[PDB]
Symmetry: C3
Subunit: 428 residues, 3 copies
């Protein structure tokens, strides 16, 4: 119903908080399995092989069988540690985006909630606006019952009556789709929700803009994430340089072999050479290798990981201009939002007393009923400008606080405290 | 010209019926090559090797040369069955979306055909609207030829005349880009196309909404496709468990070797050891391997494909709310569509006789010619939006029928039967 | 400030000429490392192995430290050559895209420049339109100070006055976001920019349309890029058939081993066999292998790069209809741009003298001040449509000429010479 509970009814029932929770727990499980090649390895083998000779080798035969246990452990790696560093940068990026999944969750779930309530309230001034068109249409037709005016005012109020019928029909459809927004993110139908107390509405002034360069350049998730990808490109420089490294190896392998004998050249002149033994063997191993001449494959990957480093530096420049653009664009959205809201209050008041002055001008007949529906219509327009711009002001609150990246569930909770009384969803 | 034949022109010359047909034949051809590693493998080998010795090998020399023939066969795999049924669930995903390429083909080619008809007919009422502004403009200027009215009526209707000139200009460009719907999608041009019999139109009432929960959840391609990816993820759990499995191996080979002899310590005190033989060899092979200790990537992708199992479960939840959203949103689109059609029919009536009583109201002079052009313009809005209420209702027909997944070339054919008389595609 | 210098201040400061030049130098550096497997490859090895027996084999022990020098060279490949010429189709398609990055960067730096100019000019027309609303509003209120008019034009002009306040507020915001377009792309702030000398602006007639099928089908980067992807797919057909090729291989190695001895059953009846001195060894090798029976993986990839052959062939059909769509759509955008501009100039003249004859009709009182603000409003609409349609005209020059792919820094310079005097950003 109200905000944070629907957030609860989103935080349990967002398929992308559960999908993305599956992403981040898959990413930390991915840290676990990226750690998994660091372990030793153990396995068994066995084989059977027949032999036969010819071409100055015919007459001697054999069959051979063996088994072997093998456990290995590396005596050099930086790459699993490297891919563990890129692994933790990557799952840390997944936590950055996952904070953008709770941040996006509150952002578009609360935003979508404001679209639901927005379709309720714009649909509501559509309703009362239709009521005004039907009152002046109705009393106009009543003046036609004695025969005062030509029918085209009645039928222009009928055609525009069909227009506001299309507005409550299609805006009714927009609220149906808004029920598919709470049914898209939340999943269900709520017959009423928490509306807005428009009475205590105030003009909160935002932060200084270069202070928001500090808030953005300190508190962005995105170019932080470009530092993770960019330093990750430095780890790809050093990972090609892991491509330049020598190595040592540890292995272990026991095994058995019998290798029975057969053939014409085998039996005869054997002399204890061809007697059957029961061979058992225990083995250990090491292996050094050095990169003498790779052919220069590394120092191409170094340069291209520098190209990812400076390109990702241009993703901190892209993200720099982008979230500079977010807090400054959003900043001016708050500015023209607030000042435009002041114009909406004076437009509502001047449209109200001007509406009543059109009631005066129509009571004396200097202006027709057309201007009555123009100050009426324009009045309801300014009603949706002010109230809907309160919703867009709420979106502006999500622009500043979500642009901060520190939008918690308590900013979400305070915006739940901004709410008020429940209003139904499907009237007639 | 008519619908389905252009669909035939789509079914021959959609580059994604052809290219995506090639994608689905790439998927089934990929079932063939996904089956291909299961087959035995036969190949050749040959090598030349020289030896030279020093320091306990100084004076003994040799060289080596061998040939070989190798056919192998696996005596375990289950992963190629899930390469193969990844390949068949996912080839069936390509058939899901390729049935959504005929469904998308009819969808956006018939939709785009309705955009061509939309540009022709909205542009046509733009033409006749310009004719109305030119009859009252020309008639008003004709009454100015004796000097009845003010010139600002003639020049306001010259600015509005330039406006409807601009509307037939850029809506002429929408006809040009509609020729780029026929030419972007169909590839070609028609001088005229089969329009809509708008005169016999009726309001069909759609299905019950929960019957479309059963019907939509019955014949969705998308979350069926998520079940393909999702049981696919279940055998990625069980394909990490294919990594948990032991194995047996079959190989086969044969070869020849000569190994001529040379050197100072070689010849002398040989004693039949260094006589030349020309060894021939036949070999078979089997190999077992045992998952004794595998580092713990074991069971990790079990967990991560549980995050893909719940992942595609939230893609069947996302797809669930998405196609519930599609047929319910589309349902309300048909509702406000039909009721809006009623609104525009009453707008045709009320704007019609209201326009005629503005001809009366202007013949008496109580209203100016401005209101005549406004009820005229509004009447053409009831024309373009009753006719485009029919056209968006045709899009609504593709919203229900394409949202069902039941759409075929016979629903396509029935919408070709809905067509009528051809109207030209380049008038003046 | 003036155009191409901003481009200069965008060419050094494009994150995607730096990013994407880093991509293309990554592609050329990837020609280098794509050549690096073709090089002879040299490296070192060293290892050590202990022996111990049991089960009728107990009592034998030995050890050997081997070092090895290994240089290899292939005596068949076409794949690294086709990786290298897929690296020339990748560096060459990457050059197609990077010419589309200079091309697209000029396209959107000049486009975005026109958007900044658009926000400035529409903002200024909002300014002077507000000035007209305040002159007639103020004069109207002063006529109420003697008592001539009704207050509903004063307060409806306060609703419209607050409206144009909200329009210089939100168009002030479009200015601010346009500063975030110069700060999004240029990255910085400019105090003023080059306004257009609109006085010498004239219409230029475009090229013949089938001649633009020659210029487009000759001078597309995109379906050229589909040709490179397409012959790329032709030697993916024949790179599968490179998978059908037999092959020969050259290897080289040497090194030492030590092979000392220990044990209980080792010692006893040695006879010069168990004397310790440390071996040296030299080796080479070859490998010729033939696709005798491979399971038929190839001839599926052949058909699927026929599916990629019709992939990029129906991307040359998709790209064909797309750039036919680009220059025909853009062509008719030039046409409706020109004729619409002519309608805008006649809207300027007819709305101007119509506005003056509404000043006559209001000075005599036959029409109210509402029509004065409608011809005023519509006049400023002809201003914004006119100069903004000059931005539509020049942006159509970017559409057709960037559609030719020969839109260069000199067409950038030509439109830089189309500029004139600078106007600042932020007055009151």
């Amino acid at each position: 119903e109200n905000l944070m509970q629907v957030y609860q009814q989103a935080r349990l029932s967002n398929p992308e908080l559960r999908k993305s929770a599956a992403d981040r727990d898959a990413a930390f499980e991915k840290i676990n399995e990226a750690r998994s090649p660091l372990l030793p390895q153990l396995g068994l083998g066995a084989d059977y092989t027949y032999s036969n000779g010819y071409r100055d080798a015919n007459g001697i035969n054999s069959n051979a069988t063996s088994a072997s246990l093998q456990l290995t452990q590396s005596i050099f790696d930086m790459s699993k540690w490297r891919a563990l560093t890129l692994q933790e940068k990557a799952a840390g990026i997944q936590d950055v985006t996952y904070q953008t999944d709770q941040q996006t969750l509150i952002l578009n779930t609360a935003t979508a909630y404001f679209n639901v309530l927005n379709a309720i309230d714009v649909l509501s001034y559509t309703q009362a606006q239709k009521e005004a068109i039907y009152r002046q249409l109705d009393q106009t037709t009543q003046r036609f019952n004695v025969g005062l005016v030509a029918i085209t005012d009645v039928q222009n109020a009928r055609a525009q009556y069909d227009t506001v019928l299309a507005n409550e029909v299609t805006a009714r459809n927009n609220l149906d789709n808004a029920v598919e927004q709470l049914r898209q993110i939340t999943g269900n139908y709520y017959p009423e929700l928490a509306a807005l107390n428009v009475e205590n509405f105030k003009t909160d002034k935002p932060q200084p803009v270069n202070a928001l360069l500090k808030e953005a350049e300190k508190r962005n998730l995105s170019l932080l994430q470009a530092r993770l990808s960019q330093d990750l490109a430095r780890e790809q420089i050093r990972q090609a340089q892991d491509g330049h490294l020598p190595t040592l190896d540890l292995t272990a392998s026991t095994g058995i072999s019998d290798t029975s004998y057969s053939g014409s050249k085998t039996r005869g002149a054997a002399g204890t050479q061809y007697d059957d033994s029961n061979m058992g063997q225990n083995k250990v191993g090491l292996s050094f290798s050095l990169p003498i001449y790779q052919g220069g494959m590394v120092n191409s990957q170094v340069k291209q990981a520098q190209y990812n480093f400076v390109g990702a530096s241009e993703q901190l420049e892209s993200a720099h201009r982008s979230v500079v653009q977010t807090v400054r664009s959003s900043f001016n959205n708050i500015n023209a939002s607030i000042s435009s809201i002041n114009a909406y209050k004076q437009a509502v008041v001047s449209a109200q007393s001007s509406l009543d002055a059109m009631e005066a001008g129509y009571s004396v007949g200097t202006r027709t009923i057309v201007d009555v529906l123009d100050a009426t219509t324009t009045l309801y327009n300014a009603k949706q400008e002010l109230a809907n711009a309160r919703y867009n002001y709420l979106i502006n609150q999500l622009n500043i606080k979500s642009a901060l990246g520190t939008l918690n569930e308590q900013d979400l909770l305070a915006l739940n405290n901004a709410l008020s009384k429940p209003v139904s969803t499907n009237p007639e």
